[PDB]
Design an enzyme around this catalytic site. Structure first.
Site, PDB file in Angstrom:
ATOM      1  N   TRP A   1       1.776 -28.624 -11.351  1.00 30.41           N
ATOM      2  CA  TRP A   1       1.280 -29.629 -12.290  1.00 30.41           C
ATOM      3  C   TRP A   1       2.411 -30.480 -12.882  1.00 30.41           C
ATOM      4  O   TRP A   1       2.950 -30.157 -13.936  1.00 30.41           O
ATOM      5  CB  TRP A   1       0.458 -28.948 -13.407  1.00 30.41           C
ATOM      6  CG  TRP A   1      -0.847 -28.372 -12.897  1.00 30.41           C
ATOM      7  CD1 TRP A   1      -1.987 -29.064 -12.620  1.00 30.41           C
ATOM      8  CD2 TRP A   1      -1.125 -26.999 -12.573  1.00 30.41           C
ATOM      9  NE1 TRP A   1      -2.956 -28.214 -12.147  1.00 30.41           N
ATOM     10  CE2 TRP A   1      -2.453 -26.941 -12.104  1.00 30.41           C
ATOM     11  CE3 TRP A   1      -0.379 -25.814 -12.629  1.00 30.41           C
ATOM     12  CZ2 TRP A   1      -3.052 -25.754 -11.693  1.00 30.41           C
ATOM     13  CZ3 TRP A   1      -0.984 -24.632 -12.230  1.00 30.41           C
ATOM     14  CH2 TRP A   1      -2.307 -24.612 -11.770  1.00 30.41           C
TER      15      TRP A   1
ATOM     16  N   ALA B   1     -15.063 -19.877 -11.294  1.00 25.37           N
ATOM     17  CA  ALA B   1     -14.803 -21.289 -11.527  1.00 25.37           C
ATOM     18  C   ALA B   1     -14.390 -21.932 -10.219  1.00 25.37           C
ATOM     19  O   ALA B   1     -14.021 -21.235  -9.259  1.00 25.37           O
ATOM     20  CB  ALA B   1     -13.721 -21.479 -12.568  1.00 25.37           C
TER      21      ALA B   1
ATOM     22  N   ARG C   1      -1.284 -36.840 -13.536  1.00 25.21           N
ATOM     23  CA  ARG C   1      -0.105 -36.184 -12.979  1.00 25.21           C
ATOM     24  C   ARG C   1       1.046 -37.168 -12.778  1.00 25.21           C
ATOM     25  O   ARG C   1       0.837 -38.291 -12.331  1.00 25.21           O
ATOM     26  CB  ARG C   1      -0.438 -35.478 -11.664  1.00 25.21           C
ATOM     27  CG  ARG C   1      -0.545 -33.968 -11.770  1.00 25.21           C
ATOM     28  CD  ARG C   1      -1.956 -33.465 -11.562  1.00 25.21           C
ATOM     29  NE  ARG C   1      -1.967 -32.534 -10.434  1.00 25.21           N
ATOM     30  CZ  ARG C   1      -2.910 -31.629 -10.186  1.00 25.21           C
ATOM     31  NH1 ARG C   1      -3.952 -31.488 -10.994  1.00 25.21           N
ATOM     32  NH2 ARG C   1      -2.804 -30.850  -9.120  1.00 25.21           N
TER      33      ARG C   1
ATOM     34  N   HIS D   1      -5.453 -31.020 -15.276  1.00 17.05           N
ATOM     35  CA  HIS D   1      -6.675 -30.634 -14.592  1.00 17.05           C
ATOM     36  C   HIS D   1      -7.750 -30.525 -15.662  1.00 17.05           C
ATOM     37  O   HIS D   1      -7.438 -30.557 -16.846  1.00 17.05           O
ATOM     38  CB  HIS D   1      -6.501 -29.318 -13.832  1.00 17.05           C
ATOM     39  CG  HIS D   1      -5.822 -28.249 -14.619  1.00 17.05           C
ATOM     40  ND1 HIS D   1      -5.335 -27.091 -14.040  1.00 17.05           N
ATOM     41  CD2 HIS D   1      -5.526 -28.153 -15.940  1.00 17.05           C
ATOM     42  CE1 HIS D   1      -4.785 -26.335 -14.966  1.00 17.05           C
ATOM     43  NE2 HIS D   1      -4.884 -26.954 -16.132  1.00 17.05           N
TER      44      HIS D   1
ATOM     45  N   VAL E   1      -7.299 -17.434 -12.089  1.00 14.27           N
ATOM     46  CA  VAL E   1      -8.332 -16.906 -11.217  1.00 14.27           C
ATOM     47  C   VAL E   1      -7.803 -15.863 -10.198  1.00 14.27           C
ATOM     48  O   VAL E   1      -6.842 -16.117  -9.473  1.00 14.27           O
ATOM     49  CB  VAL E   1      -9.099 -18.102 -10.564  1.00 14.27           C
ATOM     50  CG1 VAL E   1      -8.774 -18.277  -9.063  1.00 14.27           C
ATOM     51  CG2 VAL E   1     -10.600 -18.016 -10.865  1.00 14.27           C
TER      52      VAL E   1
ATOM     53  N   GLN F   1     -11.300 -35.003 -11.440  1.00 15.37           N
ATOM     54  CA  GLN F   1     -11.684 -33.680 -10.958  1.00 15.37           C
ATOM     55  C   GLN F   1     -13.107 -33.357 -11.427  1.00 15.37           C
ATOM     56  O   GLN F   1     -13.594 -33.913 -12.413  1.00 15.37           O
ATOM     57  CB  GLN F   1     -10.721 -32.604 -11.474  1.00 15.37           C
ATOM     58  CG  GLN F   1      -9.294 -32.705 -10.973  1.00 15.37           C
ATOM     59  CD  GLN F   1      -8.514 -31.399 -11.123  1.00 15.37           C
ATOM     60  OE1 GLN F   1      -7.672 -31.071 -10.282  1.00 15.37           O
ATOM     61  NE2 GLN F   1      -8.794 -30.646 -12.188  1.00 15.37           N
TER      62      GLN F   1
END
Ligand SMILES: N[C@@H](Cc1ccc(O)c(O)c1)C(=O)O
Ligand SMILES: N[C@@H](Cc1ccc(O)c(O)c1)C(=O)O
Lengths: 266, 266
Positions: free
Chosen positions: A65, A230, A120, A94, A177, A134
């Site tokens: 990122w 997610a 970004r 994000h 995640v 997104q």
């Protein structure tokens, strides 16, 4: 006589922006699976953009990122409960923070899909933007499992590409995640595998983070005995395949000759 | 100077019809539960309006439907597969035929919701029309059960009336459904039970009828080992409670002063 082909009072015809169309089909698709769409702020705290998502300071995972850091005095950046939040300001890298956001303000089970403008620090070429969109997904509750993540994506693909379509899941790493994964869709008229987005089962440390924030706000724990999945799916990429747009730079361009080309679409 | 409050070039502002709004919220509500909306013809055969729904000739159950019979020569009334259909012509007394229709043309599992204009030979007063709208539901597949019918209605009610709302189910008779039932919703700001529509588990003889029609068309059986639930819900009634309309006769009236009142709503 009255020449009846003679052009009529030329009134203005409106139109929607390519991304808006794509965003729409997207939410429409997911709202039929019972996802509801909410939004979040474009100016975020590091706590929401990073810390609450298990992306810590000076961690080699932050390099995924390239971030814009903002400065500025006297700027109320409001949190999940409208409370004035503090923290080092930035631009969303994000939409992911929105799910920490949402989880603090609501309780399981739920399905949400969150669109947004995201930023970004990157070099604007033909397949890359410094500013793009997104679409996040978050489904949390008792019993939720990775089979349901795959099911969702399978459903996404069926609707964007028809029956001849199939989805591919591969392990990949995101700090927020685990098990984590990248997913690709198979698009028949292209004979191509589209890398669409990343996903997984929301990370134990995320649930922990939100329930912790909850306490600070005086709220009760709500995520001790639930699981979740997610996904993060980049929209320009998808719009490009769909409307046949050769250059991402067009989206932010203002060229009417470009925009106007999309008045028809639905 | 240029008096800046001075009214501007008066352009035309459009609007939607009360029923359209109500129909919309309805389908929107159900499409979030995964119902897809399809329509059917307003001019129907007795076979589709009656026989295929277990409503036979000279049966005392046909009296629930005061029917308009049509005559006329040279009129292709097209069936589920576009085939030219024969049979004694009438006006839809309910949207229900659409589900025999649909079941012939598709295969389980599916969720559908079908809106339509429907007709009855009845005396136009203030709470009654000879022409009004219904919204049908049909969910067929392996495992489908009455718990799912109740679930749907519970969901309908939650969305039209908020959390303070609850639903009531009572046995009642329809030839195309057993167990059959009438359902009412509880609407808090009214302290009133709304009788909303009828419903049940689609009748064994209906499935039989469609699979039979299928054979005639050369198609394979598709409804031997599936169950289903349908519901029929009248829309004007609901629109009246929602937009506060005192008189059903208004809907078909053409009064701009009436229609215009709904430009705002969303
Ligand atoms: N937010 C991530 C994508 C993502 C990955 C995993 C999960 C999720 O919900 C979203 C990104 O910027 O690429
Ligand atoms: N079509 C019925 C209503 C109905 C009853 C049971 C079931 C269903 O799907 C629909 C009517 O005209 O009142």
């Amino acid at each position: 006589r009255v020449d009846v082909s003679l052009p009529g009072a030329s009134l203005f015809s409106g139109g929607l922006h390519p991304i808006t169309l794509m965003e729409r089909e997207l939410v429409e698709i997911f709202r039929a699976l019972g996802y509801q769409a909410v939004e979040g702020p474009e100016v975020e705290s590091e706590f929401f953009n990073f810390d609450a998502l298990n992306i810590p300071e000076h961690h080699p995972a932050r390099d995924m990122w390239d971030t814009f850091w903002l400065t500025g005095e006297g700027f109320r950046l409001e949190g999940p409960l409208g409370e004035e939040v503090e923290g080092r300001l930035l631009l969303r890298t994000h939409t992911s923070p929105m799910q920490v956001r949402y989880m603090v303000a609501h309780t399981p089970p739920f399905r949400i899909v969150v669109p947004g403008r995201v930023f970004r620090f990157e070099q604007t070429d033909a397949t890359h933007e410094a500013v793009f969109h997104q679409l996040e997904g978050l489904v949390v509750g008792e019993g939720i499992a990775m089979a349901h993540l795959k099911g969702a994506i399978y459903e996404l693909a069926q609707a964007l590409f028809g029956p001849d379509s199939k989805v591919r899941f591969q392990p990949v790493y995101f700090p927020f995640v685990e098990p984590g994964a990248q997913f690709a869709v198979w698009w028949p008229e292209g004979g191509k595998w589209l890398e669409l987005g990343g996903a997984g089962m929301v990370h134990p440390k995320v649930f922990q983070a939100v329930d912790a924030y909850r306490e600070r706000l005086g709220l009760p724990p709500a995520y001790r005995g639930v699981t979740g999945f997610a996904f993060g799916l980049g929209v320009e990429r998808l719009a490009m395949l769909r409307y046949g747009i050769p250059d991402i730079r067009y989206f932010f361009g203002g060229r009417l000759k470009f925009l106007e080309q999309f008045k028809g679409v639905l």
